[PDB]
Homo-oligomer: A and B are copies of this chain.
Amino acid sequence: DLDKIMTKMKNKSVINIDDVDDEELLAILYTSKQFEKILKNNEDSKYLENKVFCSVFLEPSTRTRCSFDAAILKLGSKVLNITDMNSTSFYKGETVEDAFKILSTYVDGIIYRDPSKKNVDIAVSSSSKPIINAGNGTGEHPTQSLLDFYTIHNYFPFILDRNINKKLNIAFVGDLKNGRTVHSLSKLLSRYNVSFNFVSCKSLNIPKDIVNTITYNLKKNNFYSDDSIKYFDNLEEGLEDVHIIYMTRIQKERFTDVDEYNQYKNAFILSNKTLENTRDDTKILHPLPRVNEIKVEVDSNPKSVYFTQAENGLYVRMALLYLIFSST
């Protein structure tokens, strides 16, 4: 019932993936699928024409910012842009609360990226218009999780059924400790019948916090067992019997010590060889950009869908904006 769902979603801020419930998630997946058909047939996509947004990006994140701008403008809307290298360079003396109180009288909605946990939450309480969090310091990047799930669901639509006999097995590989994308998508997937392989070097293990949350979310639907969560330090064991391989970025800005960065960047390299004993239906995701995590040769392997995944982002962002901001 897209109409009941849309009334509920209208004017919603999306800050954490838990702001999206089951019915909203189905509305987003369905709407995303419509926009995919629309774009792929070169149909008119201007379903949100009279809106003006502000996109405020207070750290270097030009790829994410451009993804949101492309979705706004493809919807037929307009966007003005605030971009700065950090938040203090923009706010200067001014409080986040004043800035958002006024900005929100200028525009119909705001896309906000700020590594400060606190700033996004201040923004939301002071804004008189809906905010979409495009990523913040505290591990929430909801539109990424949504586009990841959309992508997963396209190959394995049983993920939505909550069928005790149809379990999806995913391996997360790389920086589990700091990977926000992993945190947020884990939280979402664990609402469904999903089992997890965590593959990482010791100092980049998945945090306890995330494991507790995954545990809680699986138990809630009686899908939690001792086989639900496995831990591995090598690909040959961790890649066995998974439907999805999700490779994280290894972010240089996160590892000061360049030797640590060099150790972690080359610990898990996906090649055609490391893929030989995976399931025939397995699909490889990566939020992008990559550096050495996935060899170029893998781009020709039909198991890889990480470029399709990034393209799916346009559809899913358009869908989310449309559902929140349309007057109908």
Contacts and interface: CB of A to CB of B under 8 A. Distances in A.
Contacts of A291: 92-94
A50 B90 CA distance: 32
Nearest to A97: B296
A201 interface: no
Contacts of A289: 92-94, 98-99
B106 A67 contact: yes
Interface stretch (A74-82, A162-170, A227-235): A74-82
A46 B52 CA distance: 11
A73 interface: yes
A102 B70 contact: no
A288 B97 CA distance: 13
Contacts of A124: none
A131 to B, nearest CB: 16
B62 A106 contact: no
Given A94-B291, A289-B94, A74 B52 contact: yes
B73 A80 contact: yes
A211 interface: no
Nearest to A252: B93
Contacts of A82: 62, 66
Contacts of A99: 289
Interface stretch (A13-21, A179-187, A307-315): A307-315
A7 to B, nearest CB: 16
Which of A42, A73, A307 gathers most chain B CB within 10 Å?
A73
Nearest to A45: B50
